[PDB]
Design a protein around this ligand. Structure first.
Ligand SMILES: [Mg+2]
Ligand SMILES: [Mg+2]
Ligand SMILES: [Mg+2]
Ligand SMILES: [Mg+2]
Ligand SMILES: [Mg+2]
Ligand SMILES: [Mg+2]
Ligand SMILES: [Mg+2]
Ligand SMILES: [Mg+2]
Ligand SMILES: [Mg+2]
Ligand SMILES: [Mg+2]
Ligand SMILES: [Mg+2]
Ligand SMILES: [Mg+2]
Ligand SMILES: [Mg+2]
Ligand SMILES: [Mg+2]
Ligand SMILES: [Mg+2]
Ligand SMILES: [Mg+2]
Ligand SMILES: [Mg+2]
Ligand SMILES: [Mg+2]
Ligand SMILES: [Mg+2]
Ligand SMILES: [Mg+2]
Ligand SMILES: [Mg+2]
Ligand SMILES: [Mg+2]
Ligand SMILES: [Mg+2]
Ligand SMILES: [Mg+2]
Ligand SMILES: [Mg+2]
Ligand SMILES: [Mg+2]
Ligand SMILES: [Mg+2]
Ligand SMILES: [Mg+2]
Ligand SMILES: [Mg+2]
Ligand SMILES: [Mg+2]
Ligand SMILES: [Mg+2]
Ligand SMILES: [Mg+2]
Ligand SMILES: [Mg+2]
Ligand SMILES: [Mg+2]
Ligand SMILES: [Mg+2]
Ligand SMILES: [Mg+2]
Ligand SMILES: [Mg+2]
Ligand SMILES: [Mg+2]
Ligand SMILES: [Mg+2]
Ligand SMILES: [Mg+2]
Ligand SMILES: [Mg+2]
Ligand SMILES: [Mg+2]
Ligand SMILES: [Mg+2]
Ligand SMILES: [Mg+2]
Ligand SMILES: [Mg+2]
Ligand SMILES: [Mg+2]
Ligand SMILES: [Mg+2]
Ligand SMILES: [Mg+2]
Ligand SMILES: [Mg+2]
Ligand SMILES: [Mg+2]
Ligand SMILES: [Mg+2]
Ligand SMILES: [Mg+2]
Ligand SMILES: [Mg+2]
Ligand SMILES: [Mg+2]
Ligand SMILES: [Mg+2]
Ligand SMILES: [Mg+2]
Ligand SMILES: [Mg+2]
Ligand SMILES: [Mg+2]
Ligand SMILES: [Mg+2]
Ligand SMILES: [Mg+2]
Ligand SMILES: [Mg+2]
Ligand SMILES: [Mg+2]
Ligand SMILES: [Mg+2]
Ligand SMILES: [Mg+2]
Ligand SMILES: [Mg+2]
Ligand SMILES: [Mg+2]
Ligand SMILES: [Mg+2]
Ligand SMILES: [Mg+2]
Ligand SMILES: [Mg+2]
Ligand SMILES: [Mg+2]
Ligand SMILES: [Mg+2]
Ligand SMILES: [Mg+2]
Ligand SMILES: [Mg+2]
Ligand SMILES: [Mg+2]
Ligand SMILES: [Mg+2]
Ligand SMILES: [Mg+2]
Ligand SMILES: [Mg+2]
Ligand SMILES: [Mg+2]
Ligand SMILES: [Mg+2]
Ligand SMILES: [Mg+2]
Ligand SMILES: [Mg+2]
Ligand SMILES: [Mg+2]
Ligand SMILES: [Mg+2]
Ligand SMILES: [Mg+2]
Ligand SMILES: [Mg+2]
Ligand SMILES: [Mg+2]
Ligand SMILES: [Mg+2]
Ligand SMILES: [Mg+2]
Ligand SMILES: [Mg+2]
Ligand SMILES: [Mg+2]
Ligand SMILES: [Mg+2]
Ligand SMILES: [Mg+2]
Ligand SMILES: [Mg+2]
Ligand SMILES: [Mg+2]
Ligand SMILES: [Mg+2]
Ligand SMILES: [Mg+2]
Ligand SMILES: [Mg+2]
Ligand SMILES: [Mg+2]
Ligand SMILES: [Mg+2]
Ligand SMILES: [Mg+2]
Ligand SMILES: [Mg+2]
Ligand SMILES: [Mg+2]
Ligand SMILES: [Mg+2]
Ligand SMILES: [Mg+2]
Ligand SMILES: [Mg+2]
Ligand SMILES: [Mg+2]
Ligand SMILES: [Mg+2]
Ligand SMILES: [Mg+2]
Ligand SMILES: [Mg+2]
Ligand SMILES: [Mg+2]
Ligand SMILES: [Mg+2]
Ligand SMILES: [Mg+2]
Ligand SMILES: [Mg+2]
Ligand SMILES: [Mg+2]
Ligand SMILES: [Mg+2]
Lengths: 272, 49
RNA sequence: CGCGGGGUGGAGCAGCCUGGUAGCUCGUCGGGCUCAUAACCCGAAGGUCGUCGGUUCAAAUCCGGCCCCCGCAACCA
RNA sequence: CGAAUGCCGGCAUGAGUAACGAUAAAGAGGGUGAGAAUCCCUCUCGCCGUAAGCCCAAGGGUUCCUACGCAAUGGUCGUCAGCGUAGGGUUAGGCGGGACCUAAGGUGAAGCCGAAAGGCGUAGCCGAAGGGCAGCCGGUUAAUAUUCCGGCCCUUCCCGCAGGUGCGAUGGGGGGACGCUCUAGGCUAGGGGGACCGGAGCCAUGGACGAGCCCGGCCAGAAGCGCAGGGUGGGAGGUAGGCAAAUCCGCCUCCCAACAAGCUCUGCGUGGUGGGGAAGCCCGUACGGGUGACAACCCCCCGAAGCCAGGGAGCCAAGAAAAGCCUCUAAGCACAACCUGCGGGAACCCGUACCGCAAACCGACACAGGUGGGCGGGUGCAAGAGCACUCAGGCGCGCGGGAGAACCCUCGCCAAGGAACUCUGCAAGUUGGCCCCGUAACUUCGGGAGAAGGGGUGCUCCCUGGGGUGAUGAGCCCCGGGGAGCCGCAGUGAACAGGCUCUGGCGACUGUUUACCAAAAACACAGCUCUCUGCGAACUCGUAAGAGGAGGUAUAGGGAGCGACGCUUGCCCGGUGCCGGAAGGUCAAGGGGAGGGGUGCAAGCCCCGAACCGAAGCCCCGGUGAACGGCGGCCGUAACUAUAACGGUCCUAAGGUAGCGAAAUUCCUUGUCGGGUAAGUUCCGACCUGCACGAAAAGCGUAACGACCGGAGCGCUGUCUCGGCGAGG
RNA sequence: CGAGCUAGCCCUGGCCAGGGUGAAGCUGGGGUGAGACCCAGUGGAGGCCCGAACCGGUGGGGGAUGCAAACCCCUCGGAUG
RNA sequence: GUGGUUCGUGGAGCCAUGGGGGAAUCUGGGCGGACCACCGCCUAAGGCUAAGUACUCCGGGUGACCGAUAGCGCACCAGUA
RNA sequence: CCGAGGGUAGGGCCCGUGACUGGGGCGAAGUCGUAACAAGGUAGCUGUACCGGAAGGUGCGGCUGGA
RNA sequence: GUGGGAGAGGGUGGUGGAAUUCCCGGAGUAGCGGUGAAAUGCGCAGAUACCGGGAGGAACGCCGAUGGCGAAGGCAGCCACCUGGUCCACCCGUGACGCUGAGGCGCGAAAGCGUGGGGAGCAAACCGGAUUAGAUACCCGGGUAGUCCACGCCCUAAACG
């Protein structure tokens, strides 16, 4: 989708909005299973650690289910599909037959009315979740766990997905939304299908405000400020850095790798 | 234009208050000295009810 | 005015700083192949080294004086 | 002690000089008084009136009220006072705050961390104009009143009775509970009109005894209705979720409803009763009292932004918690307990004066400054919180009197010319509201547009079309059309109310900034690209613990630069950076000890110490420019000259492509041609010999946009020729 | 020792008169095999437009032992983000 | 690896120590300035212990100390206005 | 009232002219190279795309007016 | 109409093997590439050649034809669904309903452009090595857009019988 606009105001011409057709006549969220008071704040205890944040629409947290072995075997019916301000993926709310309700990040396909479930059993269909081993090599899938019982963590962004590649001992090779081939443990669930609402990468914010709404204040270039507060700074009419591009704190930012070398997680990785 | 003193009872006891100064090691010393110097008033005289 | 770089056969460049020995590409001349010209092949010629001085036994080469040439600086007021 | 712009104090000079704090404005009579422009009274004049009038809040803290007083305080005076002396004055179960709740955030048992001091820290606690919560109208004081008193109406607790029911928790569920914009129906506040009702009175100056002028025609109000409107399905089986249990909630499944029919719950009327009640006239105030009065207390119209409220519609940026309250069950307990009615008793602490856009708060001051919330009447101008006047109310700003020079400030006007002024039309002028004609290039089809340029605008009479409230009518209130006619110099007659166009530069644009000399072409900006980061992420703060990132997960997050958009973004990896290279060279502690020394009669003890084995880094080998950067010189050549498509040579890591160019880059320079001019170092169009443009410190364009900078025209003008008169301070 | 001025963000309240312009979306019609699309009428979008409150501070003038250690007059930017 | 001592790595002991290795109970162990031999001195890894010494909020005595711009900031209702 | 015309304002078409600039046509014997015609010594022609003093080259697909 | 027939006609989904390139393991050396000849290039840091495994992309050998099909452009492994045209027989039904077609409309190789994906081989531009007088070419080694998919444009051709 992606709503468009006629130019009746510069900016609201290039501006592009999402299409909330996929939003089952829902909107008002569900008390109980979410929401919780969401403590918004751009800095830690005192100081500001991440810069340029703050401001932007008030938000309510939708406490989603990111570990599904909670209900192994208990099937549930997908009730609605709603908007979640805390993420890029739309989310689906679903009523188990157990009578319990919980939200799930909604996969592309999954339609309201559908029945979905989790566990070793589970049929390989959009929405169902199973330990990685039991999933057919090659099938795509989202909401992966990295270590058994620790909760989902990979491919949860709007319309992202990972594809299974092979098996190898108690591990199974994956291919993350980034292109890294990772070795994940067999016992990590991963609900099947891709995340959906993949038009998300196409929304043209539009104006200055639009960014402000999502809570992101203006970002000033180092080049603009002085030597006192950033490498690229001073002296006359602009300047060409004058040294290898660096961050406010001073480490190179055009090429310098960061992953800490001797990490134990190294051996389970294979790509880029 | 607007100036720098905008009186506020709450802020004043809340900041230069007595329990305020007792709470920290530096403030307790603030008291010591003032006590040791004589000062009729150890801390500002906030008021009302 | 000041700083440093440079004048070498006809053209463009080496050759010095560790003085004795001028090298390369083109061009020019004679000869070949072609019907003929170019290409290609075979041979040959050409340099007071910007000039006036001395330095040494000996100066393109070292050192000072001028003749042009090129580039850089001419800021604070 | 004679000097140190010395230190403290006292006194001079400028000097009876500048000032006396908004240009809203004063005059007079009569009081009082030792003493009145300045105090009290009355008459007249002027000023604010979406305040310069009222109600809160914060701050202030006796300033409130009354009596007696001027030495000082008042920018003069002072009999006055916000000043001095004394006395009085602030009354609450319903207002606000606390014996209620939670937000951020603090505090912080458990836990973790830190040389010490201390740092974190799920529970709990604390934390408020957010939630919960029971009072309205009138009367009295010199000063308090939703507080005292009158009327009317409530809320809790406890102790009874009278009945009902498994009662019951800090525990389970429900509710409370939520955005922004736009909105419907019916009400209220508030306001307009009245031939009706109620009133002291009044015929002036030429007319008017008239349905004449003037004044006023309500407020509160339980039950019960009535009118609006908000909430909400009722049964029954099954149950494995709601961290124990539930009959509750949730999930299936059959019934009946789908309607607000019915239950409730608010608001608005109406309501037993209770209260107010003008002008004017009389009085004595420093003000209030009395009469008017048995006051009347009625009919229409406008009408909310307020009420019904958890109303509806739309949208994307997707919009607190906890308690009270309903319900559910657990331990317990069911002679308890809880629910419903009726009684009797109990209901505490603090605030309450007065100032409050200001002479009482923030500014050393009776300071032209600063200060959040609510009410803010009437007429006219299209509307309105704008504008002019003016209600209620409150002012004339605590030095006056004269004078009528220059010169200044603010203001008005001008012959003829009209930008000649000048760095620049700076300043001033022009234009100006509504209604209707009518509008170009260009363009991203929206815009440019209020383009430009025009005409209409008053009042009188006649005819006529819609609504709105009433019934389908009168009136009352909105919107229209058409025809005649009147008067002025002039009809948004005063007040509020764009000068217009052309073309360049910069930046896309709305935004932001050097509080107190710079508002921009600078910052930001959507968007483009590079780069890091697989999640106990990178990164940032911190000694740590920790926290942000993020309750996110590559369509995600951090760093850099570029900066809507269009067409594009060339070549060089030699140097620097970053990246990729299990070969080598070098390499620190350490391993290793050939070998050497010192002492001992000696076993020994103690030193030195070469092979060799030894990381990362450097070297080296590669890559990589939307990484740091760079992107040439000298000669010759064409059948007029001239110039060079062509060539030669030297050096380079490669040797600037496109596009642009006397530029926001051009020194020589007012380059040279062309255009605007009477004339143009500026401007615009070209030319290229680009001192010293050039491709994401982007390049060249670009509709729209601008208190940005340059040029030009029209209009208009005291800017100028070149002044002149008038006004007030 | 200070964030009672000022900068930023967190929690929770408040405020923005009155006019313009008219987006999508609906609805009717047109059209097509079905569309796209074209018309009205409705609709009320917007870092849209005028303009008080309010937030500013552009140009000139006054003020410069000031009324004021940032003021006053005229003029002006934004004003549902 | 450092500190302490006069000792700044010096031929650098001793006395303290964070890091690693790591004993013995009198024929045991430290020290006497690298080390070694001899000759000597002490007996670590547990603790308590007057007096002599410091100071002057306070009381007293004295002054080749001041005499109200001195002397304490204050002679005086001053850590006040 | 209409009204020739004149005045003000802005559009539409056309002709003229303008520094400079684009390509063009023509002009016996100037310079560069050799593209096509023989298999033209890389078969040629082509739509497009990029590049180059120049003819032209190369990429993609097509045609026989070539084998 | 009824009953049948052939077909690389068209759309979507799915799937098979061969080969290539890269990665990993084994084994193995002193050269491999390349051309008219070479050089650039690759390789003792372990290449070329052989084996084993893995990833991915694109095009479908034999069948294959001078064949088929479509209106043209054009269409080729295999499967399925959805779908157009078409030929034969039977002469059953309608009953002149027919031919052409300004405009409109739809389709339209390749290159190209937009947004996103993908990227093995190839290959404009470009960089190197030769050849030449000079080579911005022909040859050789590199190599980017592109070639591939989705959707939206673009309308050209020796779109040729
Ligand atoms: Mg909750
Ligand atoms: Mg911190
Ligand atoms: Mg803190
Ligand atoms: Mg994009
Ligand atoms: Mg920035
Ligand atoms: Mg700066
Ligand atoms: Mg800093
Ligand atoms: Mg720096
Ligand atoms: Mg510069
Ligand atoms: Mg530089
Ligand atoms: Mg710099
Ligand atoms: Mg100077
Ligand atoms: Mg002296
Ligand atoms: Mg003095
Ligand atoms: Mg004087
Ligand atoms: Mg005087
Ligand atoms: Mg005077
Ligand atoms: Mg005054
Ligand atoms: Mg008035
Ligand atoms: Mg007093
Ligand atoms: Mg008083
Ligand atoms: Mg008195
Ligand atoms: Mg006086
Ligand atoms: Mg005064
Ligand atoms: Mg008196
Ligand atoms: Mg008094
Ligand atoms: Mg109590
Ligand atoms: Mg409490
Ligand atoms: Mg909390
Ligand atoms: Mg703490
Ligand atoms: Mg806490
Ligand atoms: Mg609490
Ligand atoms: Mg409260
Ligand atoms: Mg209360
Ligand atoms: Mg009072
Ligand atoms: Mg409960
Ligand atoms: Mg609850
Ligand atoms: Mg008369
Ligand atoms: Mg009533
Ligand atoms: Mg249970
Ligand atoms: Mg009365
Ligand atoms: Mg609602
Ligand atoms: Mg609580
Ligand atoms: Mg019960
Ligand atoms: Mg009170
Ligand atoms: Mg009061
Ligand atoms: Mg107010
Ligand atoms: Mg005054
Ligand atoms: Mg004041
Ligand atoms: Mg204000
Ligand atoms: Mg009003
Ligand atoms: Mg008006
Ligand atoms: Mg006004
Ligand atoms: Mg005049
Ligand atoms: Mg005149
Ligand atoms: Mg004129
Ligand atoms: Mg002039
Ligand atoms: Mg002049
Ligand atoms: Mg000008
Ligand atoms: Mg002006
Ligand atoms: Mg301009
Ligand atoms: Mg402009
Ligand atoms: Mg700008
Ligand atoms: Mg400033
Ligand atoms: Mg501005
Ligand atoms: Mg300024
Ligand atoms: Mg964390
Ligand atoms: Mg978080
Ligand atoms: Mg990023
Ligand atoms: Mg910039
Ligand atoms: Mg380089
Ligand atoms: Mg490099
Ligand atoms: Mg390299
Ligand atoms: Mg490296
Ligand atoms: Mg090494
Ligand atoms: Mg030029
Ligand atoms: Mg000229
Ligand atoms: Mg001229
Ligand atoms: Mg330049
Ligand atoms: Mg530049
Ligand atoms: Mg570049
Ligand atoms: Mg920049
Ligand atoms: Mg650049
Ligand atoms: Mg730029
Ligand atoms: Mg702006
Ligand atoms: Mg004048
Ligand atoms: Mg005067
Ligand atoms: Mg419409
Ligand atoms: Mg609007
Ligand atoms: Mg706006
Ligand atoms: Mg500002
Ligand atoms: Mg405005
Ligand atoms: Mg030491
Ligand atoms: Mg010893
Ligand atoms: Mg000893
Ligand atoms: Mg002791
Ligand atoms: Mg003294
Ligand atoms: Mg004395
Ligand atoms: Mg003193
Ligand atoms: Mg012409
Ligand atoms: Mg011409
Ligand atoms: Mg020739
Ligand atoms: Mg040829
Ligand atoms: Mg050929
Ligand atoms: Mg050819
Ligand atoms: Mg071609
Ligand atoms: Mg080429
Ligand atoms: Mg028949
Ligand atoms: Mg046809
Ligand atoms: Mg096509
Ligand atoms: Mg194509
Ligand atoms: Mg290749
Ligand atoms: Mg090639
Ligand atoms: Mg040749
Ligand atoms: Mg053909």
């Amino acid at each position: 989708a992606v709503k468009k606009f006629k130019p009746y105001t510069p900016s609201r011409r290039f501006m592009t909005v999402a299409d909330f057709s996929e939003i089952t006549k829902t909107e008002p969220e569900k008390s109980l299973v979410k929401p919780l008071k969401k403590t918004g704040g751009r800095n830690n205890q005192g100081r500001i650690t991440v810069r340029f944040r703050g401001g932007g629409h008030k938000r309510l947290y939708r406490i989603i289910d990111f570990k599904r072995w909670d209900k192994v075997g208990i099937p549930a019916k997908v009730a609605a599909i709603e908007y979640d301000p805390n993420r890029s993926a739309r989310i689906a709310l679903l009523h188990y037959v157990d009578g319990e309700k919980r939200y799930i990040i909604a996969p592309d396909g999954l339609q309201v009315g559908q029945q979905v479930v989790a566990g070793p059993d589970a049929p390989i269909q959009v929405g169902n979740a199973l330990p990685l081993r039991f999933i057919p090599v090659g099938t795509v899938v989202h909401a992966v766990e990295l270590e058994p019982k620790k909760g989902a963590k990979l491919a949860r962004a709007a319309g992202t997905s990972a594809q299974i590649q092979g098996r190898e001992g108690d591990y199974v090779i994956l291919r993350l939304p980034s292109g890294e081939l990772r070795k994940v443990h067999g016992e990590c669930y991963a609900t099947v299908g891709a995340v959906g609402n993949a038009d998300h990468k196409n929304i043209v914010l539009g104006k200055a405000g639009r960014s402000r709404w999502l809570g992101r204040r203006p970002h000033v270039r180092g080049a603009a400020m002085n030597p006192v507060d950033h490498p690229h700074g001073g002296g006359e009419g602009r300047a060409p850095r004058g040294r290898p591009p660096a961050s406010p704190w001073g480490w190179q930012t055009k090429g310098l790798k960061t992953r800490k070398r001797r990490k134990p997680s190294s051996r389970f990785i294979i790509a880029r | 234009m607007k100036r720098t003193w905008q009186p506020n009872r709450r802020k004043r006891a809340k900041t230069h208050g007595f329990r305020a100064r007792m709470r920290t090691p530096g403030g307790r010393k603030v008291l010591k000295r003032r006590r040791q110097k004589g000062r009729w008033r150890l801390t500002p005289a906030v008021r009302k009810r």
